[PDB]
Amino acid sequence: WDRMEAFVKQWNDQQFDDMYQSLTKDVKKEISKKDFVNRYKAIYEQAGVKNLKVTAGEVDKDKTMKHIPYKVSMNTNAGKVSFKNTAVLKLEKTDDEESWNIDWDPSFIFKQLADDKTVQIMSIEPKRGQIYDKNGKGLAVNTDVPEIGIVPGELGDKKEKVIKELAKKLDLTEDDIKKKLDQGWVKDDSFVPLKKVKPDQEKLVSEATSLQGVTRTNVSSRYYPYGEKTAHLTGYVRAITAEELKKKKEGTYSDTSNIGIAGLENVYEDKLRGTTGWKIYVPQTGEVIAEKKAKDGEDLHLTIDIKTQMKLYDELKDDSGAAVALQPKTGETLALVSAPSYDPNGFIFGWSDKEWKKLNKDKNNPFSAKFNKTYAPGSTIKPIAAAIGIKNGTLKADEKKTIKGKEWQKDSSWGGYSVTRVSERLQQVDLENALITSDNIYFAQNALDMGADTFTKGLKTFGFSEDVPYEFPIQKSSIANDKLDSDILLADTGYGQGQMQMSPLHLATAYTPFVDNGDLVKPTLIKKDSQTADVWHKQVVTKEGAADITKGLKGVVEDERGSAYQPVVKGITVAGKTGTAELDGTENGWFVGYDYENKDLLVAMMIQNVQDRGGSHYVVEKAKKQFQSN
């Protein structure tokens, strides 16, 4: 019949407002359309009802009352659910027109339901996988932390004064505690959790539990054992919002779930979470409509060495910038540091108000990692360019160039603009002395002699303009705002005063061909039991070209004329390059270096607001400390 088919179509399509219209006059009373629609929406939403199939059968007796059997199957967060039932169709006249109407009752939601029975949907959170460094040191783990609560029966006739004192002691409100004590499940002998506390605060727990009826347990909790020292690398988890929950695939989260918002917590959310358990049941009888068991998440093992991480943190902790430390042979990531930072434990245990407001008004954006953003690299481009110039035959490292004065233009067509070098001591300038004196004209002429096409292709072999193959998302490096579309922009990009932007991670990666082999190494955060150093582009420079570049980068640190000579550090065997990118404004300082003798460490460091602190020098002093002085 038409009415039944239309009702079934509306219900398969889950349009409950259209469904309410077909109900009998009796059911219209005692159940308002508001309550009908709200009850369906709430139950189906919270249970995760999807894949709904309602199919109708055949009538039996032939009249003003019919019976039509039907069946319902569906998928819920707790599994497949299906039942059979019989709809009563009564013919009824309202106003002046008859119609067949369905005599609805709560058993059309789930079969167990009736006018004295409801449904409840509880969830079981799995154990989240943990994050370890290369030596098994826990970076994002699960630990048992104190949990202060109230047993109501133990309060006696002191409930009010106890709530007042405990609210003052735990920085909660009296209303919040009372709301928790008034929950439906709360019985006089049950422990009512009130607040989770960090492990280092047993004195607070001792003070608080010494009140009437206030007691203590331990609850499992995420914990970030090194806090802001690894905050950008771990990221964090925190409670999911109702709006976030509405966007996810039903079943994967509940209203009380943690979700990874930033860092590796977010990047590996699926691996770390696991499977959420569910139970749909009827509270008046205890009957279970459906049930699904949880499943723990998987652990994550990183290449990070927390010792290197902490050395870099100690150097950057009061500044604004980033530092990457790679093992340039294997491509493993020893350290990823960004400053300023934050304690991700704040998102688990709660923030103090002053700290939250501090972090949100900080103009250097503590919650944002800087090692995956792209900044102007400045002079640090020069060796890379040199590599390309040696790779594509247009540059010989041992041949000197004629440069007279401190200014140079290609021809009259530049006019008022010329490339400026800081010194004019050397008139015959080879590659080594070009790097040591950071000669801008040398490298402008390198770019020009090279041409735009070869230089673009070369920059692409060092990983510009492509997705960065790395497990932590890295914004792509840019050669120019559009393209190298003029001799002037080409020359400026040659010596690092153009439109280019690199990430610290990428700059670290792009000095790896200089260390030994010439290969651009594929960086990785994930610890692998395989001792296989993956290559990202093969032989982007030759071995002998890498040696030629290493000579000049060595000189930058060891020759008195170099930009990285001060401070003189006995013991280190470090070759590298400095940079300063300007922004009455500020300027950012760069140092990229590697151990040209031990070949097992490379660091890139970038610090902001260094114009009044000696520029790149301020960075250099902090960078040399990171290297083996043995």
From Swiss-Prot:
InterPro entries: Bact_Transpept/Beta-Lactamase, Beta-lactam/transpept-like, MecA_N, NTF2-like_dom_sf, PBP_dimer, PBP_dimer_sf, PCN-bd_Tpept. GO terms for biological process: cell wall organization; peptidoglycan biosynthetic process; proteolysis; regulation of cell shape; response to antibiotic. It is found in: Cell membrane; Forespore inner membrane; Forespore outer membrane; Membrane raft. SUPFAM superfamilies: beta-lactamase/transpeptidase-like, NTF2-like, Penicillin binding protein dimerisation domain. GO terms for molecular function: penicillin binding; peptidoglycan L,D-transpeptidase activity; serine-type D-Ala-D-Ala carboxypeptidase activity. Its EC number is 3.4.16.4. Penicillin-binding proteins (PBPs) function in the late steps of murein biosynthesis. Probably required for both cortical and vegetative peptidoglycan synthesis. Although not usually required for cell division, in the absence of PBP 2B (pbpB) it becomes essential. Confers resistance to oxacillin and cephalexin. This is Penicillin-binding protein 3.
